[PDB]
Amino acid sequence: DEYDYLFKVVLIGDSGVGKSNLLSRFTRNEFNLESKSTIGVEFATRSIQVDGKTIKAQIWDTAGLERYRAITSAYYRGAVGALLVYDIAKHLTYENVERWLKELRDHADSNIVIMLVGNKSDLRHLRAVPTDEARAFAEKNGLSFIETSALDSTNVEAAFQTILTEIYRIVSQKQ
Amino acid sequence: SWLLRLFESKLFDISMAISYLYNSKEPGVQAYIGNRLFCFRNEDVDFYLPQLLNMYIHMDEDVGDAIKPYIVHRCRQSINFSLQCALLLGAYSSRGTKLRKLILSDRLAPEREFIKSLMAIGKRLATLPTKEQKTQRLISELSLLNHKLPARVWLPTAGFDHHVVRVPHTQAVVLNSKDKAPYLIYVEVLECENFDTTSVPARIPDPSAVALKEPWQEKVRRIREGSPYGHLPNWRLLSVIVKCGDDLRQELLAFQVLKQLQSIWEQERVPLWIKPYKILVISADSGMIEPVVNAVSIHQVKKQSQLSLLDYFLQEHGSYTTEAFLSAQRNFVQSCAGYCLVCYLLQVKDRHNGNILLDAEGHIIHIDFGFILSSSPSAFKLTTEFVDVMGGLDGDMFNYYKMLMLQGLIAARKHMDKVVQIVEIMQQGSQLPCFHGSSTIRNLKERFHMSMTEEQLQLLVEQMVDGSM
Ligand SMILES: Nc1nc2c(ncn2[C@@H]2O[C@H](COP(=O)(O)OP(=O)(O)OP(O)(O)=S)[C@@H](O)[C@H]2O)c(=O)[nH]1
Ligand SMILES: [Mg+2]
């Protein structure tokens, strides 16, 4: 039969933070160290089940580069979920998080669920962003927060199922 | 996922790590390896430090930024590592100037003043055209360094952390009568667990001070008995050759190749014998070399004893039927084959009896590995004398010598890339004469003959032996 819900979730963030690999690890449990730049958008999907209700998660990995930026702003439309991904080894990607927040609040819904993701946690010795600071920033702006690693699959499904169940909670409570 | 399966497999050592770091143009890979460097044992990465810093200096900033965190951390950990880094960065730059100055600025003052003092002393001996005059002024100059000791000063050519406390100036000697003459010195030090932890020892103020041509052990006993620090169980004696006017970079490369080939032959259970001596590059025109004890050049042997090498073997180790002569002959054969393979692979030129050393056991030890690979001033030869020592052309030991060469050659083939890598990475942006040709690496690769079978390698060894005579 039919799904109970079709959740639209977009992956946004600076180019190179590891969105495509987070997506590939969540949907196909695969990883590639030599992943090339995403051209426009990449589509993956996964059906989860929450509270007896079936929910198909349509996930769109958007391109971090400006080249396809406008095209990535058309996938903000109708999106109930958004993962703002940065790199813990590159501080600049953490700096642009606010900009991604602004753009997300410019081209998407105001009631969208935002999950702050700090990818590449396996690179312990290359860390440029402390967890406490990022958590503080996430809590200060009413965002979810989690540090992931697509390489060793740490907190990937945790992040996705977290934002998905949160979305389901928000949808159900408003009904 | 294959590559990730590889990087996390048991096959992933510092060698392959640096290989991929050198070849890959993927930022994720560079970052992964840059973080992975922290997971390797310090002594494993230390051997490849010159390659790493060379990559930092003469390659794109992605590689350099990938390597930089590890180098910074290690520099924060070890002051010796900081010194080595500053030296190698200075010597191989003609980018890392800022990093070098950052390392020097941090503490390193006593060490730099010490080294500069030694080099200054080395330079001041030019006004004396003789070995003995030079030696006299050397002892005089060194007699004025002990007043500045002890201090946060050490010899990087030692395999342990320590503080320099004394210098038996009377025991020092200049090695030749050339302009920038290298000089040998002995240094009394005190070994600690960690140099960065323990501070400097206190100072404590004509029987022993006579310089004789005695063995290393007797030198140690003599110097220690007359030393104010000698009663300490902490006390240990070191020895270094200071070269104030000698580029030792090619020597360092050759040292790495030697260590590698040694490791390979040990792994493949091939009884070849070589003796790599530590090299300390201080600049592009100066450095230090840890000498091999109880060993004198073949020339010095045939000059002091005035005998042929075989005669000297019969005088020093006994007649043909003695155990000592047989053992010494075995050592001679194995060392000869080993350094034959070394000279063939590295294309070592300027080979004479002034460069070939001889120790008490009967090993030969090639030194002064300048003019290798492409650079040429005269390669290694098999003189009648060496064959006479090995017992003749049709002898068992000569056949065993050739067979040792073949075995070591096959062993080298089975681990060729690990040797080629060392040279290939150092070639990057190098102004060294040993890279004068545009195809040094190609020729090096060709000298391994990977396309040949074992029979063809046998024929190759036969041709090589025939040609070297
Ligand atoms: N160590 C480690 N490396 C990662 C991780 N995730 C991604 N990478 C590496 O970072 C590089 C970039 O990852 P990638 O997934 O292509 O970023 P992206 O955000 O999708 O890039 P784009 O589509 O916005 S342009 C890749 O080479 C990948 O190997 C991770 O979790 N841990
Ligand atoms: Mg991508």
mmCIF file of C-alpha atoms in Angstrom, chain A residues 25 31-36 122-126 151, chain B residues 1 3-4 7-8 26 28-29 31-32 35 38 69:
data_model
loop_
_atom_site.group_PDB
_atom_site.id
_atom_site.type_symbol
_atom_site.label_atom_id
_atom_site.label_comp_id
_atom_site.label_asym_id
_atom_site.label_seq_id
_atom_site.Cartn_x
_atom_site.Cartn_y
_atom_site.Cartn_z
ATOM 1 C CA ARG A 25 26.642 5.762 4.406
ATOM 2 C CA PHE A 31 32.060 5.259 1.603
ATOM 3 C CA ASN A 32 34.602 6.606 -0.880
ATOM 4 C CA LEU A 33 37.734 8.520 0.126
ATOM 5 C CA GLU A 34 38.076 10.059 -3.336
ATOM 6 C CA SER A 35 34.540 11.439 -3.677
ATOM 7 C CA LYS A 36 34.288 14.099 -6.379
ATOM 8 C CA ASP A 122 37.526 10.377 13.051
ATOM 9 C CA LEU A 123 40.107 13.061 12.265
ATOM 10 C CA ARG A 124 40.701 13.590 15.996
ATOM 11 C CA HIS A 125 44.162 15.124 15.657
ATOM 12 C CA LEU A 126 43.029 17.546 12.947
ATOM 13 C CA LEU A 151 34.155 7.034 7.339
ATOM 14 C CA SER B 1 35.516 1.260 -0.396
ATOM 15 C CA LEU B 3 40.967 2.135 -0.789
ATOM 16 C CA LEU B 4 39.499 2.561 2.697
ATOM 17 C CA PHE B 7 44.305 2.163 4.481
ATOM 18 C CA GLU B 8 42.834 0.309 7.456
ATOM 19 C CA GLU B 26 42.447 14.065 -3.200
ATOM 20 C CA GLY B 28 40.180 13.716 1.758
ATOM 21 C CA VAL B 29 43.080 11.306 1.312
ATOM 22 C CA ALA B 31 43.702 14.828 5.348
ATOM 23 C CA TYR B 32 43.158 11.172 6.250
ATOM 24 C CA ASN B 35 45.707 12.559 10.670
ATOM 25 C CA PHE B 38 49.729 10.588 14.565
ATOM 26 C CA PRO B 69 49.996 19.489 12.154
#
